[PDB]
Amino acid sequence: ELLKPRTLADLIRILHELFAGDEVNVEEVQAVLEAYESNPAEWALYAKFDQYRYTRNLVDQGNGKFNLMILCWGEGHGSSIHDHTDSHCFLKLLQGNLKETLFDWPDKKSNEMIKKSERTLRENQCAYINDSIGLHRVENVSHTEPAVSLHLYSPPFDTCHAFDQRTGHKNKVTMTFHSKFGIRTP
Ligand SMILES: N[C@@H](CSOO)C(=O)O
Ligand SMILES: [Fe+2]
C-alpha cells in the first residue's frame, strides 16, 4: 500500500518497505518518489556543492538493498554519458532543472554517439533509467540556478562506465561520495 511521503524521512521509511523483498516494483518506487514534495529544509544537510563539478551526497544505504543520495549541480555542471551497472536508477528533482539526454549503447565500431532524445526534468519530477533503456547524460544547463536531485540505485553500485561521445569508447569510473549522512568525506 503506497501512501504519500510526508517528509524525506517518511520517504526513506517507505522505500525500506518497498525494498524489503528481492525484487523491485519500478512503477511503485517512481510513484512514491514523485509524491514526495521537495522541502529544502529536510535535505539542506545533504546539499553540499562544489565550485567545479557536481557532488554526490549519500543519504541512506537501504539496509543494503539500495543507495539513496543527493546530487548538487552548480550552474553549467553536468555528468558524463554513463551506464548504471545493471541496476535500477531513479532520479527526482528537488530544486532547479536538469537536462537528461538519452543515448543508445554504442556499436563495437568507433562512431559518434548520437542522442536518441532529450528532455527537461523539472522540480519534483522523477525519472527512471536502466541499462536496458540506454545510457544517459544529465546536465544543469542553467546559468543562474543551481540544481539538486535525489537519486536511488538498486542494487547499490560504486563503479560504472563513462562513454566518449565522439567514439562510443567506454572507460570504467569509480564514483565517490562528497559526503555521507551529512558529513563531508574527503
Ligand atoms: N548516474 C549519475 C547521475 S545521473 O544518474 O540518475 C550519478 O549517479 O553520478
Ligand atoms: Fe545516471
Side-chain angles (χ1 to χ4, degrees):
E1 175 176 8
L2 307 179
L3 294 176
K4 181 181 161 72
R6 302 169 250 111
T7 67
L8 179 56
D10 202 37
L11 172 60
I12 293 169
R13 194 261 310 163
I14 294 164
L15 294 172
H16 286 157
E17 295 172 358
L18 290 174
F19 283 87
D22 286 342
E23 302 287 314
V24 181
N25 186 324
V26 170
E27 289 82 12
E28 292 186 350
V29 175
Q30 191 168 0
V32 305
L33 289 168
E34 179 122 350
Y36 167 58
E37 287 181 50
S38 178
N39 176 349
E42 292 172 0
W43 50 256
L45 182 60
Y46 310 107
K48 299 177 208 289
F49 285 75
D50 178 86
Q51 181 177 342
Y52 303 105
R53 63 152 277 190
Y54 77 96
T55 59
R56 303 168 79 257
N57 301 280
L58 183 64
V59 172
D60 192 86
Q61 290 184 300
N63 293 150
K65 293 284 183 52
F66 64 81
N67 274 348
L68 183 73
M69 62 191 67
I70 285 174
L71 274 59
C72 299
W73 316 74
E75 289 147 15
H77 289 179
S79 78
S80 63
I81 298 173
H82 55 274
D83 62 355
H84 299 82
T85 309
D86 288 310
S87 298
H88 300 290
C89 184
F90 304 82
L91 184 175
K92 177 209 175 70
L93 267 288
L94 299 178
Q95 175 184 295
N97 298 285
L98 292 170
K99 186 167 81 153
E100 180 187 33
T101 303
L102 300 202
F103 293 85
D104 287 324
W105 285 92
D107 288 343
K108 287 186 183 184
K109 180 173 168 182
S110 166
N111 262 329
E112 174 86 16
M113 306 181 65
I114 308 307
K115 50 207 64 177
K116 92 174 72 163
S117 63
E118 282 179 358
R119 66 179 156 164
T120 289
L121 301 172
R122 314 192 167 285
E123 286 188 4
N124 279 313
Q125 299 188 331
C126 181
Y128 171 75
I129 194 157
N130 70 39
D131 286 351
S132 74
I133 291 173
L135 309 167
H136 77 177
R137 188 206 293 283
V138 174
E139 298 174 286
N140 181 13
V141 298
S142 186
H143 290 263
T144 54
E145 300 298 339
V148 180
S149 54
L150 177 69
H151 300 238
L152 188 159
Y153 301 118
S154 185
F157 63 96
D158 38 28
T159 67
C160 65
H161 301 89
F163 298 71
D164 168 30
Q165 196 174 337
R166 301 289 96 79
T167 63
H169 178 76
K170 76 178 152 66
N171 36 285
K172 194 173 201 209
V173 293
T174 298
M175 285 164 311
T176 61
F177 289 113
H178 189 69
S179 71
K180 294 188 176 168
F181 314 121
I183 306 295
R184 181 73 175 86
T185 52

